[PDB]
Design an enzyme around this catalytic site. Structure first.
Site, PDB file in Angstrom:
ATOM      1  N   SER A   1       0.812  -1.208   0.000  1.00 34.09           N
ATOM      2  CA  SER A   1       0.000   0.000   0.000  1.00 34.09           C
ATOM      3  C   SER A   1       0.850   1.265   0.000  1.00 34.09           C
ATOM      4  CB  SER A   1      -0.926   0.001   1.213  1.00 34.09           C
ATOM      5  OG  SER A   1      -1.804  -1.103   1.162  1.00 34.09           O
ATOM      6  N   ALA A   2       0.185   2.415  -0.034  1.00 35.84           N
ATOM      7  CA  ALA A   2       0.858   3.709  -0.050  1.00 35.84           C
ATOM      8  C   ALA A   2       1.963   3.855   0.994  1.00 35.84           C
ATOM      9  CB  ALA A   2      -0.168   4.819   0.125  1.00 35.84           C
ATOM     10  N   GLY A   3       3.194   3.997   0.513  1.00 35.64           N
ATOM     11  CA  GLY A   3       4.331   4.165   1.398  1.00 35.64           C
ATOM     12  C   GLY A   3       4.417   3.166   2.536  1.00 35.64           C
TER      13      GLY A   3
ATOM     14  N   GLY B   1       6.766   0.836   2.786  1.00 40.48           N
ATOM     15  CA  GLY B   1       8.114   0.304   2.878  1.00 40.48           C
ATOM     16  C   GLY B   1       8.365  -0.815   1.887  1.00 40.48           C
TER      17      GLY B   1
ATOM     18  N   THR C   1      10.205  -0.981  -0.446  1.00 37.74           N
ATOM     19  CA  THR C   1      11.642  -1.133  -0.631  1.00 37.74           C
ATOM     20  C   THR C   1      12.308  -1.878   0.519  1.00 37.74           C
ATOM     21  OG1 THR C   1      11.640   1.262  -0.129  1.00 37.74           O
ATOM     22  CG2 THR C   1      12.427   0.571  -2.310  1.00 37.74           C
TER      23      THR C   1
ATOM     24  N   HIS D   1      53.779   3.766 -52.972  1.00 36.75           N
ATOM     25  CA  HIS D   1      54.630   3.483 -51.825  1.00 36.75           C
ATOM     26  C   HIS D   1      54.409   2.025 -51.444  1.00 36.75           C
ATOM     27  CE1 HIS D   1      55.680   7.675 -51.271  1.00 36.75           C
ATOM     28  NE2 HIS D   1      56.327   7.389 -50.156  1.00 36.75           N
TER      29      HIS D   1
ATOM     30  N   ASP E   1      61.348   5.397 -45.794  1.00 36.19           N
ATOM     31  CA  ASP E   1      60.826   4.450 -46.771  1.00 36.19           C
ATOM     32  C   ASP E   1      61.731   3.239 -46.927  1.00 36.19           C
ATOM     33  OD1 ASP E   1      58.302   5.404 -47.693  1.00 36.19           O
ATOM     34  OD2 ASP E   1      59.314   6.979 -48.837  1.00 36.19           O
TER      35      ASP E   1
ATOM     36  N   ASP F   1      63.923   7.314 -50.307  1.00 36.11           N
ATOM     37  CA  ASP F   1      62.576   7.802 -50.060  1.00 36.11           C
ATOM     38  C   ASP F   1      61.860   7.905 -51.398  1.00 36.11           C
ATOM     39  OD1 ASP F   1      60.322   9.626 -49.857  1.00 36.11           O
ATOM     40  OD2 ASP F   1      61.060  10.093 -47.843  1.00 36.11           O
ATOM     41  N   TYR F   2      60.959   6.966 -51.668  1.00 35.36           N
ATOM     42  CA  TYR F   2      60.217   6.999 -52.919  1.00 35.36           C
ATOM     43  C   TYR F   2      59.294   8.200 -52.816  1.00 35.36           C
ATOM     44  CZ  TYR F   2      61.225   1.896 -52.527  1.00 35.36           C
ATOM     45  OH  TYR F   2      61.762   0.641 -52.349  1.00 35.36           O
TER      46      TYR F   2
HETATM   47 CA   LIG Z   1      58.251   9.149 -49.097  1.00 38.70          CA
END
Ligand SMILES: [Ca+2]
Length: 1155
Positions: free
Chosen positions: A22-24, A26, A28, A937, A1048, A1061-1062
């Site tokens: 019922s209302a309140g 407990g 929980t 690359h 590279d 270095d390409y």
């Molecule tokens: Ca490069």
DNA sequence: ACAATGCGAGCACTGCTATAGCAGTGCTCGCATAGAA
């Protein structure tokens, strides 16, 4: 019948139990208790077979905040009862009665310890969380996707569906029919507003549905036919101007003709006023002639509605579903729906058992709000099953969520199936005076909640509260006070203007008398002045709230509507900000800017605007100002800009000082928080401006754009709705409009025998009567919750309300309202009859007064204040900046997030291509950009320089890379040409390099301490390098830290090591651009020269590190740059470039780092 | 460089036909029209 006063510790933890909290009461405290028992297997005969784990005790709540609190409350109780097990002594109720039931405090302590650390997995989910959880685990049985997306739309998906229905169903219609439909509904919008409730949740059963095949055409025929034949029995019967009653004046010829012209080519079921000239009535005012067929026409309705509808929701539903499947999305109605189908299907047992094991005992909370779909799933798993327990807890008197589908009937159904009933008899939380008044009221008649299955049993008020009382300007007031308006008649209009007024007055009356210590909430001999934070006004709808907020606000009594749903986007501020963003986005345009400045948010004057228009220099001043804000916007974002704006014009500080300004500010700040999100989702400022408009135009979306309540409202009389109030507690509460009722007209009822949701698509008085019943059956249920919210006292407004346009015939249909029905014990009453019924029951706790209006605009409260503040100011300073650069101190940005998404992207290339396609493919026409550059690359990332170039590998490389196969010849010939290309001099050619002498893509990290100054480095770079003689350099600024870098290729020609270095670049037409001159040009152009010195400085450090005792000019002699394009089989030195660091440079450069 | 209905009242007025009561035609006008994984 009549439940056993529930004793938690002695409740039999074995199958099916219904608990009425019922209302309140407990609810929980009960759940937690029961939770612990289960964990430790406590109890006795009323205990559970064995002990359960956190991940076996299933608890389902409806709210999200619910499971959070429930999950929270439990971890606590466990941590305590566990501690109270180690001390074997506890001096706090519950726990002690628990330890007495424990047989080995030392074990429970252990068992409990686990339950504690297990909580981050407690089986406490929501109805919805439980569902998609079981579903996603038993995917095969539910036919679920392992990757479902939670849909949001629907509210739209639904309209769209309802309209797809209107297009394919109504468009193809022929005029005669189309018009009929039109007179039933004008558009899809109207059709939805009629079937929207349905379409959601469990489709209701349609009482007397249309033949499973009647087409719109069919019905139409029968109707038109039934119509047109009587157009005859009147077209040819209009030769009769007959005879033999009184009152039908000869102005009946007016009646007459009005149907001869009713003879159109039909097109409208609509027919008019012949009720008189029927026959089954002409006698009511041998019986008479051949037109009594009319008696038969106005007998059973001429509609198309029920047919269409039935077709609509039926089809609309499946239309929406299909669309969800397609999208692969899933909603909540579906979530717990799909679960219900699974337990229904054949493969429903493997699922029932599966779940059942995981959760041998489950606690269902707030059960009074379940639905057929839920309860079904529930019993289909736990009903009549040894070794399991189903704890159903909630309160039928508080089931008020009908509108969302909470079917009180399915509860009463469940009430019937489980025989074990229990109630919580004690009402902690409330005052004796209150509990007494509420009990008295709901004890009046029997079956106050009018439903033999929902009986009302009074409740004992808790002792610890026996001291509670509320005194005002003298003595203690009654727990419940009824304010009655005067008079005999009273419209819904009056009973609001006047009740809100009254309510308003009584609030300031408590408040003012509160500051004077004459209004006190007392617990025996303790007390405190009532504060706004203690008053509460329950309401039924937005309006009602406003109604209250206004009369209140009229008395300077500030308030806050806790149930407000409006969004920050339709606040006058949103519009103002938008104008501002438009000014910021273009202070050039004299107008939009002025407009921005005109906004109330800028707090300017009329005078200000004027002068500022007649002074051109001060204008540009502002323009500059905003041009800065756009800058702040482009660079740091919106939030940083807006706050920058406010800080100058001192907006926040001013607004806060401008009545109702605090609200206006928080909203502006809010917008900003949303304008910030939206920013990081569009790459243009304008795109955001746009973003605003739309949102200002079409809002109310998420709850994320809902209005944030102020942190001061904890001191504002609270005006909330019966619904948002369920579960909430309030010192004092007011129910200003608790008498209204609004009769149910829609024939949607639940069959009292089969307990099913039936939809009579025909306003059959019988079924409407039934629905109207269920209506107040729910109003009472709301009434119960409303009175239940107050602790010390609650006063509601009552009036001789009257809806019936029946001239006050001793009417006062007050008895048609939950509260009236309880006051007038069922039977209707005289206006004064009410006044006498109220007096009837009314002492100690109950007491009434007449609606004593009043006035005194003041909330006559004053203030005080002393702002003695200041903000810490840090005495440190920025100083140095540690970063990890990487030959990026060069390349200007644009690579923002680029070197982030692709760490090895051919950052050295970029651009578009055009008409350089010349019909003979060459390495110069190979697609330009980064995407293709990295492809190149790529090729050399793992190639067999040694052997020849397999064309298939090349065909395959392009095929996968997304390029066209027709590039293989050119490419397969291009690669080789570069391989067998003579590097510097004696031999050296990629093809001569075997695996062992190759190391591809070397990633290095050169620490760099002592700031590297762009200028300081430019000097030495000059003296040693003739290339860096083109001295624009020092384009970066001081940097301390590290130095990333990828190489590279680094190889060794058995004698020395090298740097390759390409570099795929150029669109620069052909060959002529890859000459030893052109190359050394682009070199400084991109300042690659730096790359050299840096890279080599790294290889230096590395080789020196590895080769124990190495020398520069004995192990180096390298640096090769291959601009892939412009490299032929017989045009050496073209395409390739070579350099050899001064050695003396690397020396100073190395120590340049650490000195 | 721009505005919702619908329902009966409510009262004014108009035939009849056993001045009054019942009825019906009409136009004006006030009234009541959600809830929150
Ligand atoms: Ca490069």
């Amino acid at each position: 019948d009549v439940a056993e006063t529930l004793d938690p510790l002695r409740l039999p933890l074995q199958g099916e139990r219904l608990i009425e909290a019922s209302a309140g009461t407990g609810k929980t405290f009960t759940i937690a208790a029961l939770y612990l028992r289960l964990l430790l297997g406590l109890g006795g005969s009323a205990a559970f077979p064995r002990p359960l784990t956190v991940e076996e005790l299933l608890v389902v709540t409806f709210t999200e905040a619910a499971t959070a609190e429930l999950r929270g409350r439990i971890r606590s109780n466990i941590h305590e009862l566990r501690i109270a097990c180690l001390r074997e002594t506890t001096d706090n109720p519950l726990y002690e009665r628990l330890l007495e039931e424990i047989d080995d405090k030392a074990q429970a302590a252990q068992w409990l310890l686990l339950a504690e650390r297990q909580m981050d997995e407690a089986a406490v989910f929501t109805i919805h969380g439980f569902c998609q959880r079981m579903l996603n685990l038993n995917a095969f049985e539910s036919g679920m996707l392992f990757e479902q997306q939670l849909i949001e739309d629907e509210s739209l998906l639904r309209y769209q569906a309802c309209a797809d229905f209107w297009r394919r169903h109504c468009y193809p219609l022929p005029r005669e029919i189309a018009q009929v439909v039109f007179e039933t509904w004008k558009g899809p919008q109207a059709l939805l507003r009629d079937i929207n409730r349905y379409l959601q949740g469990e489709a209701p059963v349609i009482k007397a549905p249309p033949p499973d095949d009647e087409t719109l055409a069919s019905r139409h025929a029968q109707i038109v036919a039934r119509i047109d034949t009587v157009k005859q029995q009147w077209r040819d019967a209009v030769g009769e101007l007959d005879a033999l009653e009184s009152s039908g004046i000869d102005r009946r010829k007016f009646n007459r003709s009005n149907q001869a012209k009713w003879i159109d080519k039909i097109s409208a079921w609509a027919e008019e006023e012949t009720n008189s000239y029927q026959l089954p009535e002409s006698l009511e005012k041998p019986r008479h002639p051949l037109f009594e067929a009319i008696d038969q026409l106005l007998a059973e309705p001429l509609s198309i509605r029920d047919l269409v509808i039935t077709r609509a929701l039926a089809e609309i539903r499946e239309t929406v579903a299909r669309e969800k499947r397609r999208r692969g999305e899933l909603g909540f109605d579906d979530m717990l729906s799909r679960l219900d189908s699974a337990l229904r299907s054949e493969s429903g047992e493997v699922l029932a058992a599966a779940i059942r094991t995981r959760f041998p005992v489950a606690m269902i909370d707030e059960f009074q709000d379940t639905d057929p779909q839920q309860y079904r799933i529930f019993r289909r798993i736990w009903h009549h099953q040894p070794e399991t327990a189903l704890l159903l807890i909630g309160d039928p008197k508080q089931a008020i969520y009908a509108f969302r589908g909470a079917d009180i009937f399915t509860y009463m159904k469940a009430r019937s199936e489980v025989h074990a009933h229990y109630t919580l008899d004690t009402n902690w939380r409330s005052a004796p005076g209150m509990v007494n008044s509420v009990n008295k009221l709901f004890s009046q008649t029997d079956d106050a909640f009018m439903f033999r299955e929902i009986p009302f049993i009074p409740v004992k008020s808790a002792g610890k509260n026996q001291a509670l009382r509320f005194v005002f300007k003298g003595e203690t007031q009654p727990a419940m006070k009824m304010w009655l308006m005067e008079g005999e008649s009273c419209g819904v209009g009056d009973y609001q203007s006047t009740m809100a007024q009254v309510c308003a007055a009584q609030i300031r009356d408590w408040l003012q008398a509160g500051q004077r210590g004459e209004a006190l909430l007392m617990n025996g001999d303790d007390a405190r002045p009532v504060r706004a934070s203690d008053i509460s006004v329950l309401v039924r709808s937005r309006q009602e709230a406003a109604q209250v907020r206004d009369a209140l606000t009229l008395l300077e009594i500030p308030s806050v509507y806790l149930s407000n749903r409006d969004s920050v986007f339709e606040t006058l501020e949103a519009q103002e900000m938008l104008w501002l963003l438009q000014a910021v986005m273009t202070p050039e345009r004299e107008n939009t800017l002025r407009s921005a400045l005109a906004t109330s948010m800028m707090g300017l004057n009329a005078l200000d605007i004027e002068t500022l228009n007649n002074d051109e220099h001060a204008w540009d001043v502002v323009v500059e100002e905003f041009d800065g804000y756009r800058q702040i916007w482009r660079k740091r974002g919106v939030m940083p800009m807006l706050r920058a704006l406010m800080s100058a014009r001192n907006i926040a500080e001013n607004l806060l000082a401008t009545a109702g300004g605090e609200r206006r500010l928080t909203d502006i700040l809010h917008i900003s928080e949303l304008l910030q999100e939206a920013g990081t989702q569009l790459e243009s400022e304008h795109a955001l401006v746009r973003w605003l408009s739309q949102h200002i135009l079409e809002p109310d979306s998420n709850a994320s754009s809902q209005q944030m309540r102020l942190e001061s409202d904890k001191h504002l009389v609270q005006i909330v709705t019966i619904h948002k109030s369920k579960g909430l507690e309030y010192p004092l509460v007011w129910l200003p409009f608790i008498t209204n009722f609004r009769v149910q007209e829609q024939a949607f009822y639940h069959d009292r025998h089969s307990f099913e949701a039936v939809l009579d698509l025909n306003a059959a008085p019988e079924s409407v009567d039934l629905a109207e019943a269920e209506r107040l059956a729910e109003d009472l249920r709301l009434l119960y919750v409303a009175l239940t919210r107050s602790v010390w006292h609650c006063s509601l407004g009552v009036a001789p309300l009257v809806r019936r346009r029946g001239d006050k015939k001793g009417d006062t249909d007050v008895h048609q309202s939950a509260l009236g029905r309880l006051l007038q014990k069922g039977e209707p009453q005289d206006a004064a009859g009410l006044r006498t019924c109220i007096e009837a029951l009314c002492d100690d706790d109950i007491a009434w007064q007449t609606a004593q209006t009043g006035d005194n605009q003041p909330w006559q409260v004053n203030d005080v204040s002393t702002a003695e503040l200041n903000a810490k100011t840090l005495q440190r300073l920025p100083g140095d900046n540690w970063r990890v650069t990487s030959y990026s101190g060069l390349q200007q940005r644009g690579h923002g997030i680029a070197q982030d998404l692709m760490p090895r992207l051919d950052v050295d290339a970029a651009g578009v291509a055009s008409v350089v396609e010349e019909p003979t493919l060459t390495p110069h026409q190979f697609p330009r950009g980064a995407s293709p550059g990295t492809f190149l690359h790529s090729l050399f990332e793992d190639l067999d320089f040694t052997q020849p170039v397999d064309p298939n590998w090349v065909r395959e490389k392009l095929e996968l890379g997304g390029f066209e196969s027709q590039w293989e010849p050119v490419l397969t010939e291009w690669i080789t040409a570069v391989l067998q290309a003579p590097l510097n001099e004696t031999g050296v050619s990629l093809s001569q390099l075997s695996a062992r002498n190759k190391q591809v893509e070397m990633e290095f990290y050169l620490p760099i301490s002592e700031p590297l100054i762009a200028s300081q480095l430019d000097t030495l770079i000059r003296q040693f390098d003739p290339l860096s003689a083109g001295c624009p350099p020092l384009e970066f600024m001081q940097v301390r830290g590290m130095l990333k870098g990828f190489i590279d290729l680094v190889f060794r020609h058995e004698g020395r090591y090298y740097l390759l270095d390409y570099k795929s670049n150029w669109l620069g037409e052909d060959s002529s651009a890859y000459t030893q001159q052109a190359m050394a040009a682009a070199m400084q152009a991109h300042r690659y020269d730096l790359q050299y010195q840096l890279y080599t400085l790294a290889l230096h450090r590395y080789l020196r590190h590895r080769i124990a005792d190495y020398d520069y000019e004995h192990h180096f002699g390298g640096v090769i740059y291959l601009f892939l394009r412009g490299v032929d089989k017989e045009h050496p030195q073209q395409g390739i470039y070579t350099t050899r660091p001064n050695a003396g440079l690397i020396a100073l450069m190395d120590e340049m780092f650490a000195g």
